[PDB]
Amino acid sequence: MRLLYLHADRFEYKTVKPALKNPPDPPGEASFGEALVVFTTVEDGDGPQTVMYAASDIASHSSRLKVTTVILYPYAHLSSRLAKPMAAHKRLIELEGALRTKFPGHVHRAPFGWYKSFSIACKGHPLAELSRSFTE
Amino acid sequence: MRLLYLHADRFEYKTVKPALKNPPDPPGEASFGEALVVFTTVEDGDGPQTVMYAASDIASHSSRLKVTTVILYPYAHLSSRLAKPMAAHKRLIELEGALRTKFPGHVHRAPFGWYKSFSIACKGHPLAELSRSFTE
Ligand SMILES: C[C@@H](O)[C@H](N)C(=O)N[C@H]1[C@@H](O)[C@H](n2cnc3c(N)ncnc32)O[C@@H]1CO
Ligand SMILES: C[C@@H](O)[C@H](N)C(=O)N[C@H]1[C@@H](O)[C@H](n2cnc3c(N)ncnc32)O[C@@H]1CO
């Protein structure tokens, strides 16, 4: 699992066209205030332990930033070892569930399988932008 | 070299604090209209051939999108095999020079060595967001 932690003053996205033949999440759109935006690439070989590591780190980083909103934003472009679409959608479902057990704020899981337009205003401070890898 | 091609309706950034002890580029800020924003991570082992590959692909992708502006945005977070700061600044200088020989539009090299705040409005269409690796 490759992740990118963007501490944003603002985030919003809208799904456009389907990217997979059968996108497992309905289309949609959302906009946010301050939020840690976690760009998430599920990698071939992520399982439950990977998920719990990532959940723990996401919650601890958020606590550091004092953020109360976390967006889990599926992203196919952070690495060159992706899990297949089905497996990836499952791990993201589990990652959302797992993060709720470690983080008291708002957790928003963005839809998986769509091309999306997004806007972000990413903060300029030293820890606004960090990358993370998790494995098992 | 790891790259991320973000086809944006809009982009802007401002440098905040220094990130290296001696940032080789002066501080600054800029804002743009439509533009391909190339998030660039220089990897340990990039040389001249890597640069020319990336320049060729950047120019050809831009031609596909019919964009006329390309931002080369140094980014330390796309991979886990970075070149050292000096080497990376050099390759980005060369990448900017090389891209001018293949792409007729505006090429903006963002400053290297700063923490930055940025805003992007990234397009929703099928090729608005692509990743690329180049090696030699
Ligand atoms: C394209 C860009 O605008 C958008 N943001 C996008 O990347 N959409 C992805 C994810 O939502 C999802 N997806 C497929 N594989 C994966 C994976 N291994 N890990 C996470 N998501 C995946 O399916 C879409 C196409 O790959
Ligand atoms: C932090 C985030 O807001 C900002 N956008 C940032 O990443 N700043 C980077 C690059 O500008 C540059 N830099 C250092 N190493 C590299 C490298 N190997 N490749 C490209 N740039 C590098 O030095 C800064 C700190 O790593």
Side-chain angles (χ1 to χ4, degrees):
Chain A
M1 195 171 297
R2 187 81 188 178
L3 312 173
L4 195 61
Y5 295 174
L6 275 27
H7 189 191
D9 293 326
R10 143 185 72 79
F11 186 80
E12 63 150 301
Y13 68 90
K14 335 272 215 57
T15 54
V16 191
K17 289 171 71 193
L20 307 149
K21 192 162 147 54
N22 312 299
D25 301 329
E29 59 164 72
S31 75
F32 306 87
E34 194 171 313
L36 178 67
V37 192
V38 185
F39 279 66
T40 304
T41 301
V42 187
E43 301 185 307
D44 177 63
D46 300 341
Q49 234 177 287
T50 296
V51 161
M52 205 43 66
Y53 291 141
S56 303
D57 199 90
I58 284 172
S60 122
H61 180 65
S62 299
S63 172
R64 218 172 309 145
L65 297 175
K66 298 176 208 72
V67 315
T68 50
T69 302
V70 170
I71 316 295
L72 305 170
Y73 195 67
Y75 211 69
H77 293 288
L78 294 201
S79 89
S80 290
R81 39 189 170 261
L82 315 205
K84 306 177 160 59
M86 284 319 93
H89 180 244
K90 172 147 258 57
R91 292 317 152 163
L92 274 157
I93 287 180
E94 304 161 357
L95 180 64
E96 182 199 356
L99 179 61
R100 296 192 186 288
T101 70
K102 302 287 173 291
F103 169 67
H106 178 194
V107 173
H108 180 99
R109 181 170 62 77
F112 179 103
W114 292 82
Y115 294 109
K116 309 197 254 294
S117 73
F118 74 87
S119 166
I120 193 173
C122 180
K123 286 198 173 271
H125 78 80
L127 324 167
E129 296 180 70
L130 301 183
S131 61
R132 289 292 193 264
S133 290
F134 298 103
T135 60
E136 75 198 70
Chain B
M1 195 171 297
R2 187 81 188 178
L3 312 173
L4 195 61
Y5 295 174
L6 275 27
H7 189 191
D9 293 326
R10 143 185 72 79
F11 186 80
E12 63 150 301
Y13 68 90
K14 335 272 215 57
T15 54
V16 191
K17 289 171 71 193
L20 307 149
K21 192 162 147 54
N22 312 299
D25 301 329
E29 59 164 72
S31 75
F32 306 87
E34 194 171 313
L36 178 67
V37 192
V38 185
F39 279 66
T40 304
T41 301
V42 187
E43 301 185 307
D44 177 63
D46 300 341
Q49 234 177 287
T50 296
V51 161
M52 205 43 66
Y53 291 141
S56 303
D57 199 90
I58 284 172
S60 122
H61 180 65
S62 299
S63 172
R64 218 172 309 145
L65 297 175
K66 298 176 208 72
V67 315
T68 50
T69 302
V70 170
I71 316 295
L72 305 170
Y73 195 67
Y75 211 69
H77 293 288
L78 294 201
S79 89
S80 290
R81 39 189 170 261
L82 315 205
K84 306 177 160 59
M86 284 319 93
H89 180 244
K90 172 147 258 57
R91 292 317 152 163
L92 274 157
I93 287 180
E94 304 161 357
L95 180 64
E96 182 199 356
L99 179 61
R100 296 192 186 288
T101 70
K102 302 287 173 291
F103 169 67
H106 178 194
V107 173
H108 180 99
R109 181 170 62 77
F112 179 103
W114 292 82
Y115 294 109
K116 309 197 254 294
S117 73
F118 74 87
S119 166
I120 193 173
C122 180
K123 286 198 173 271
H125 78 80
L127 324 167
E129 296 180 70
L130 301 183
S131 61
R132 289 292 193 264
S133 290
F134 298 103
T135 60
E136 75 198 70

